[PDB]
């Protein structure tokens, strides 16, 4: 019964916009991390502080699986110590991050003839996100001296822009689905373990 449900996180037919990033908590299951790294269908698989090859015989208090969609130019930004639109305003990772940043080209799934515009990103924000911060606010951004009173125009912008995901776009303007496995170990019971 209790294999860890990475199947439904990775092979999920719907992915989330990066600003409104989805986090699945993993607890009380046995996790076969081999399925993941033996796959030949991944563009990126950069792990930080931990070896995917050596943790299907280790246990942790909580594992988090964060899923979202960005363009290829931006997957480099899903990593400790990065900066830019995505790193600062959408999904930030901490400097001492422990886990795996897994990405793949999804141009076959997340593109349409006239442009798919369902996937969004926060363009403006007064300060950078803290690690694992998630802002879904649609506050009008005040760029200028005069305050906007929820009123959009000169120096007053709607804070979300849409990705223009067309099939004929160059790799890097095409969509990539990302999953970020993160691992914590407290002095509490451990419930996420490998088969060994």
């Amino acid at each position: 019964t209790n294999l860890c449900p990475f199947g439904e996180v990775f092979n999920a037919t719907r992915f989330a916009s990066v600003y409104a990033w989805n986090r699945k908590r993993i607890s009380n299951c046995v996790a076969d991390y081999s399925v993941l790294y033996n796959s030949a269908s991944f563009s990126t698989f950069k792990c930080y502080g931990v070896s995917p090859t050596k943790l299907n015989d280790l246990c942790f208090t909580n594992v988090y699986a964060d899923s979202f969609v960005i363009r290829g130019d931006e997957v480099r930004q899903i990593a400790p110590g990065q900066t830019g639109k995505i790193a600062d305003y959408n999904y930030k990772l901490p400097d001492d991050f422990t886990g795996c940043v897994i990405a793949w080209n999804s141009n076959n799934l997340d593109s349409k003839v006239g442009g798919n515009y369902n996937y969004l990103y926060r363009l403006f924000r007064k300060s950078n996100l803290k690690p694992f911060e998630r802002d879904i606010s649609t506050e009008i951004y005040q760029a200028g001296s005069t305050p906007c009173n929820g009123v959009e125009g000169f120096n007053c912008y709607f804070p979300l822009q849409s990705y223009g995901f067309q099939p004929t776009n160059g790799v890097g303007y095409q969509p990539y689905r990302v999953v970020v496995l993160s691992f914590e170990l407290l002095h509490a019971p451990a419930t996420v373990c490998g088969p060994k």
Partner: antibody
Amino acid sequence: QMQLVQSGTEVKKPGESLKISCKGSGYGFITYWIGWVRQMPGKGLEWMGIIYPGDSETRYSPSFQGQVTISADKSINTAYLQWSSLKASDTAIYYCAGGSGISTPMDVWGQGTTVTVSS
Amino acid sequence: DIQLTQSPDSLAVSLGERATINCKSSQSVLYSSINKNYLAWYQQKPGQPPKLLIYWASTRESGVPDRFSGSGSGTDFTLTISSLQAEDVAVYYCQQYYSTPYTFGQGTKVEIKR
């Protein structure tokens, strides 16, 4: 489980360019970060730098910044370490090692490529 | 930029006796998120690549016999061979993988004493 295989012995004159290689075979490769270690004759190990093949993210050691170039080709699972102009002092044996993560021990090692630079 | 100092440089030990090697790190190598020190031990014999013995300061890499054990915390670490075997004559390096640039100890030469 997977393994790394390096280019054969080199013998060059001072001033010659050189590019030695390190190709990985085995499943679980998309995950591996590939580093270069230098061992001079009779001396200990010195970490030179590491690359991620998937996107060519390259970190150097202070001592080898802009003295060499670590490069990659994800299509053939191959990391490269190259000099534009060899000095006699570059005479050593160069190991490539592999960690399945960045901030990971080097699980897997190449057999070593012996480079002799001498007039 | 972390620096490691091993000691001693040289170490001679009778067959079946205890060998202890010390690694002093210029700085702590403790990841907060998983309570583990990011310190590894390698064995290197003549004309051979280095072999990973121990990682996370004290976890044995698979196929490493029981007689190798690693210990320490913060900045003082130890590799220990109980029962030195003929086949243990080698150089042993400690390496930190806490932060790039990774760094090795100067190495510890281990001989059989007779």
